[PDB]
Structure formats: structure tokens, C-alpha cells
Amino acid sequence: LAENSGLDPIGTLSTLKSKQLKEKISNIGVDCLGYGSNDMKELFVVDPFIGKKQQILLATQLCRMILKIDNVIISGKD
């Protein structure tokens, strides 16, 4: 998200992690859209919880599916 928004991803990720770890636990994300500051909690950028849960579950299941396949066989063409 930081890379796509034109921000330095290395600095952005580290700043977000530091703010959410040392200062306090909050909702600080990438300012993809024009905002005056970080801390989306004040910007009211909200997404459904179940949507994020489903995204995480689908990603994990897809990673397992690709990882648990060891051989690929493709038949020829006539």
C-alpha cells in the first residue's frame, strides 16, 4: 500500500510498526488517499471485520493448497 501510494515503503512500514508498538495500540495505516495525518481511527477508514477474516482465511488456504501440491502432469495435444 505504501509503495502504491507513492510513499517510501521501508520508512512507512517501520513508522507504522513503531507507532503501533511503542507509543500505543491504535489504528494507524497507509494514507493512500489525501489525508492530513495518519491514525485512520480519526480518519474513519473502516472495513468489515468478517471481510478481513475471510481474506486471511482464503489466503492461508490458497497458500496451503499451492504448497501441498508437489507434482504437476500435463497431457499432450493431438
Binding site: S14, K17, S18, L21
Partner: protein
């Protein structure tokens, strides 16, 4: 062979004693200090 091995062993001992003289003290072998330093640095870097 006896004198050659004695010379090599004494050279190694002199090197160890020199290492002690320049910086007094010994540390545990087997990579223990490496693991401990890696763990401490990983823990500390979270604040950077």
C-alpha cells in the same frame, strides 16, 4: 614430528594467550555468543 607438533601447539597457545592479554576474558564456544547476540539485537531492533 615431535618438535614440529610442539612448535605448532606452542604457537596456538601463544596466540590464545595474546588474545587474552589484549582483551582479558573468555567466552563460551559452540556459537552460543552468536545466538545470544542475534536474539538481543533482534529484540532491540524493534525499537528502531
Amino acid at each position: 614430528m615431535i618438535i614440529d607438533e610442539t612448535e605448532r601447539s606452542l604457537h596456538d597457545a601463544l596466540c590464545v594467550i595474546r588474545c587474552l592479554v589484549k582483551e582479558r576474558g573468555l567466552i563460551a564456544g559452540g556459537g552460543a555468543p552468536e545466538i545470544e547476540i542475534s536474539r538481543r539485537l533482534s529484540k532491540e531492533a524493534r525499537s528502531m
